[PDB]
Amino acid sequence: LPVVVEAHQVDTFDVPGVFYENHPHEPHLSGMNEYNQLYQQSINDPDTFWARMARDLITFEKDFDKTHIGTLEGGDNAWFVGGRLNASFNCVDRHAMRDPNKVAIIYEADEPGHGRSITYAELLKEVSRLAWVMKSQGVRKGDTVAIYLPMIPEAIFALLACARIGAIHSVVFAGFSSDSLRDRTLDARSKFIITTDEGKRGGKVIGTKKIVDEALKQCPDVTNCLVFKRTGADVPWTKGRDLWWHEEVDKYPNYLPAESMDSEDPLFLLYTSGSTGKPKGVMHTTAGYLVGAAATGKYVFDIHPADRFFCGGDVGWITGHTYVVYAPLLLGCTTVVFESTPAYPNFSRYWDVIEKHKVTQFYVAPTALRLLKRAGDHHINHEMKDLRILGSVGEPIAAEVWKWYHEVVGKRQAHIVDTYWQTETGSHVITPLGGITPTKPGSASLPFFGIDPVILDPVTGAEIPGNDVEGILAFRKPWPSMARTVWGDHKRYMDTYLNVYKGFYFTGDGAGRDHEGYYWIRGRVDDVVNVSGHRLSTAEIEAALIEHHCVAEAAVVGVPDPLTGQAVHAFVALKSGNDNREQLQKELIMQVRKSIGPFAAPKVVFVIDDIMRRILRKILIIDTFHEWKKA
Ligand SMILES: CC(C)(COP(=O)(O)OP(=O)(O)OC[C@H]1O[C@@H](n2cnc3c(N)ncnc32)[C@H](O)[C@@H]1OP(=O)(O)O)[C@@H](O)C(=O)NCCC(=O)NCCS
Numbered sequence: 001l002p003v004v005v006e007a008h009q010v011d012t013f014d015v016p017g018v019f020y021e022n023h024p025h026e027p028h029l030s031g032m033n034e035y036n037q038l039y040q041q042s043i044n045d046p047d048t049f050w051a052r053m054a055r056d057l058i059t060f061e062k063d064f065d066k067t068h069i070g071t072l073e074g075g076d077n078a079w080f081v082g083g084r085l086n087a088s089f090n091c092v093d094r095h096a097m098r099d100p101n102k103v104a105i106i107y108e109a110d111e112p113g114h115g116r117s118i119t120y121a122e123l124l125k126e127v128s129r130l131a132w133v134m135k136s137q138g139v140r141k142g143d144t145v146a147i148y149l150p151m152i153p154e155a156i157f158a159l160l161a162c163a164r165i166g167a168i169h170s171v172v173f174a175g176f177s178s179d180s181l182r183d184r185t186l187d188a189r190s191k192f193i194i195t196t197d198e199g200k201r202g203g204k205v206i207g208t209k210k211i212v213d214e215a216l217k218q219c220p221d222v223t224n225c226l227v228f229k230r231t232g233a234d235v236p237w238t239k240g241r242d243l244w245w246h247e248e249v250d251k252y253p254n255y256l257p258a259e260s261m262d263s264e265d266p267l268f269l270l271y272t273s274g275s276t277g278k279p280k281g282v283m284h285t286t287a288g289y290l291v292g293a294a295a296t297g298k299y300v301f302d303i304h305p306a307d308r309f310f311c312g313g314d315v316g317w318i319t320g321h322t323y324v325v326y327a328p329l330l331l332g333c334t335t336v337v338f339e340s341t342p343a344y345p346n347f348s349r350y351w352d353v354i355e356k357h358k359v360t361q362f363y364v365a366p367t368a369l370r371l372l373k374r375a376g377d378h379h380i381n382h383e384m385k386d387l388r389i390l391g392s393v394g395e396p397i398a399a400e401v402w403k404w405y406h407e408v409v410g411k412r413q414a415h416i417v418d419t420y421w422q423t424e425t426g427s428h429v430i431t432p433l434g435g436i437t438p439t440k441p442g443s444a445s446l447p448f449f450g451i452d453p454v455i456l457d458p459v460t461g462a463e464i465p466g467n468d469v470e471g472i473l474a475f476r477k478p479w480p481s482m483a484r485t486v487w488g489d490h491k492r493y494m495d496t497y498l499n500v501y502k503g504f505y506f507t508g509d510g511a512g513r514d515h516e517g518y519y520w521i522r523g524r525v526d527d528v529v530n531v532s533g534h535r536l537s538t539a540e541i542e543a544a545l546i547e548h549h550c551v552a553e554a555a556v557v558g559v560p561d562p563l564t565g566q567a568v569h570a571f572v573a574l575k576s577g578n579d580n581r582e583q584l585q586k587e588l589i590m591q592v593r594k595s596i597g598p599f600a601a602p603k604v605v606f607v608i609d610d611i612m613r614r615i616l617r618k619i620l621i622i623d624t625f626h627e628w629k630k631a
């Protein structure tokens with residue numbers, strides 16, 4: 001009956017009464033009334049609103065002159081212009097100064113019962129002397145630094161040592177292949193790379209040093225490669241280029257000055273798959289990104305200094321950037337660096353970790369939940385008394401999963417916060433406010449401060465006003481943590497995000513606003529599919545399949561999946577007869593595993609004789625492929 005069909009007979013659930021009774025502190029807003037009043041000031045007077053929020057949350061060396069200049073259509077937005085600051089001062093120094101022995105990082109190793117806790121003073125030392133290593137090898141303010149690290153505290157050391165000297169960290173997910181590492185290191189023109197000898201994830205060795213050596217053969221501008229001894233296994237060593245982390249840091253002082261950065265100096269690049277082309281180097285600058293990180297960490301996740309915050313995402317992706325690293329450290333609480341998987345050594349792992357370290361907020365993807373919900377409710381017998389916020393990212397936590405998350409995991413004592421955002425937005429843009437906003441299962445609820453969502457007619461591009469509407473999801477106004485460009489290709493940035501509907505920011509997502517104003521994300525309207533919370537281009541995989549000598553044309557599409565959410569399925573037509581078609585589905589799968597990485601391997605590759613991508617999506621020579629699907 002309603003135009004937003006996902007919103008038929010879905011009421012709001014209030015924040016549970018237990019949330020306030022057991023809360024160790026006072027929440028940051030007095031209620032929905034204060035959200036609405038702050039939200040309206042953030043739309044009608046962002047200059048006043050964001051100036052106060054930034055001076056509340058971020059310590060500037062030099063105060064800023066003006067909250068914002070530029071427009072969406074101009075592609076010239078700058079926030080807190082005239083300000084100077086350093087992101088690692090804000091994540092480390094100011095907290096070490098006040099409370100040197102407060103724990104900043106809880107590292108949880110691949111094996112239980114290992115790991116360690118790291119104080120803000122220890123973090124300041126490790127950031128400083130790693131920054132010393134890079135400066136000593138020639139890394140300067142404004143250079144990019146490639147980072148190919150797993151989930152160990154050393155990764156936080158590396159991002160923040162980069163920020164400390166004004167280098168621009170460019171993190172590459174440790175599940176990427178050599179080709180993908182190479183592409184990103186070249187496009188970013190990094191001359192320094194930081195990696196491990198090997199990874200350990202779920203009991204499994206990841207030959208990270210061997211991958212780096214292969215990529216580096218095609219990166220002749222990389223002149224130093226700093227290697228952290230994670231396992232101590234014999235790895236290949238290239239003298240005059242490779243350096244041991246532990247040998248070099250021991251040479252240098254335990255303190256280094258922080259470099260004074262402009263508000264709009266680049267902070268990092270994060271290569272991101274999109275609808276067309278190779279991955280884009282999404283660039284975030286410094287003050288606005290950090291303001292958005294801290295403001296969502298504070299208001300969305302109810303972070304207080306004493307909290308122990310646990311994001312489950314990998315540092316290789318934007319959730320790891322913003323909520324494993326920047327948001328919790330800016331706010332001065334403790335952050336958990338989880339090296340393992342939710343299934344190692346067993347399916348109780350997430351809750352082993354949450355009970356041992358008394359985690360207050362946990363932040364995960366629905367893929368992980370579905371993998372766990374199928375494992376059974378018996379892997380979950382933990383008190384976890386301090387756990388009051390349950391975050392979800394990447395896709396709608398649907399009703400069955402949202403119930404299992406609320407009752408079995410949270411014991412109806414925690415608030416579930418379905419945060420909608422994307423790499424380009426820097427931090428949450430549509431999300432309930434932890435402990436404040438009444439929620440609906442499967443809805444991202446309401447916009448964050450400074451976010452002005454509109455629903456657009458997909459064809460005419462016009463604004464569809466009022467409630468119970470559906471169409472393209474766009475934002476009407478700029479916001480502090482928006483991405484500022486695509487590295488080396490601002491026109492692509494304009495063409496992708498700002499020239500599609502001039503005057504608006506184009507999210508790439510379809511959405512609907514229900515009778516109450518709550519938003520329901522329908523997913524991508526372009527050829528980006530979300531597999532296991534990993535953001536993938538169907539074009540990228542098609543490009544990888546064509547890299548096989550037998551493939552002529554290739555086509556990849558995304559069909560709904562009960563565990564992976566969406567399952568990538570590939571089709572390929574061969575140039576010549578393959579007498580071993582069974583052997584070919586192995587080499588085509590390995591090809592994608594080599595061009596991108598294991599995590600992008602298609603489920604099955606179909607071979608047919610003979611682009612209307614929509615027909616393949618609805619099916620999973622038109623009658624011949626329907627028989628082909630049946631096999
Ligand atoms: C749920 C999850 C833990 C499953 O882990 P998994 O057991 O490795 O299974 P996956 O399907 O994801 O990965 C398949 C392949 O990717 C590889 N892979 C995944 N993560 C990797 C990593 N961090 N490093 C190296 N390789 C990785 C696996 O080893 C595997 O390779 P293989 O086929 O040779 O064995 C993982 O997919 C995940 O983290 N999803 C969440 C994404 C997200 O939204 N995070 C934000 C959370 S706030």
Ligand SMILES: COP(=O)(O)OC[C@H]1O[C@@H](n2cnc3c(N)ncnc32)[C@H](O)[C@@H]1O
Nearest residue numbers: 393394395396419420421422423521524535
């Ligand atoms: C993590 O940011 P990424 O850039 O990896 O993801 C970018 C892409 O994820 C999707 N998405 C993220 N959160 C939600 C969410 N709560 N609900 C629904 N869909 C979501 C969306 O399609 C976005 O365009």
